[PDB]
Prior knowledge:
Elements: H1 2-11, E1 26-27, E2 30-39, H2 47-71, H3 81-95, E3 96-111, H4 115-124, E4 126-127, H5 132-149, E5 156-169, E6 175-188, E7 204-218, H6 220-225, H7 227-239, E8 252-256, E9 260-261
Parallel strand pairs: 2-5, 2-8
Antiparallel strand pairs: 1-2, 3-7, 4-9, 5-6, 6-7
PDB class: lipid binding protein
Keywords: drosophila pathogen, erwinia carotovora, S-palmitoylated protein, lipid-binding protein, lipid binding protein
Assembly: monomeric
Amino acid sequence: QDVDLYFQNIHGRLASNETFDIVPGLSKDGAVQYQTYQFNEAPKHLQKQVKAGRILMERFVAVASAAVNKKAPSNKEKYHYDIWKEVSNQLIPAFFTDPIKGEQNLNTTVKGVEVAKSVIQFAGNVIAGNVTGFATFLQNFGNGLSAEMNKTQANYNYLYAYSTHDLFQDTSGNVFYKPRFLIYGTHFKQEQKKIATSCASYQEVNLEFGVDTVGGTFRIEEYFSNETFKKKVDNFLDKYEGKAIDDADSYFDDIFNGVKPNKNYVY
């Protein structure tokens, strides 16, 4: 309920004219890429849980985004990672476990046509297979992104506000479902802006980004076993509901096939 009070203060409602505005996905002041990644189809006995988990996480993402939108003193500050981090540090202790924080780095040199794969693999700590659908999404979105970032010489703020839905084998060969809520933040410096139109190129591109991270694993087990926990989740989500992230221009979802964890993945 300390989370409830935090959010009550920011906003001082399920009707579509009453739900809270979210931070616009693409702007001259920065972009927020709203995403839902599912890694592998769920086995028969987990499919219901996964479909519910995906809905829950998209709602949590829109709740965080709506708080930021309200809390930001100016349009520019809607794209300031530190405000996203402040709001997530309120959600995580309340509804999540295994909190993560701190910087990560993407320092790699790949062909333009491999950039989309590099993004997914970094976003999830995974070895991906076919990501051609996401590659088409990112390529087309890159046109809009490039247009905005090239308007001035300034750094262009760039955030991923997303969830991952992991269906991977434990050591005993049994599939588990891990739903994660993640907010990552970086920027494009002037010399990096070229990257946004390089997804069709077979030429090499240097990806050097310092990425600030915050996130946690959702208590999906307790949500389906503990009725009083299910209730605080549902009531909170109902009260502070943001506009659907699936209506944003920056939105993409997919079920990626043939995926396994990489050596950075934490079980």
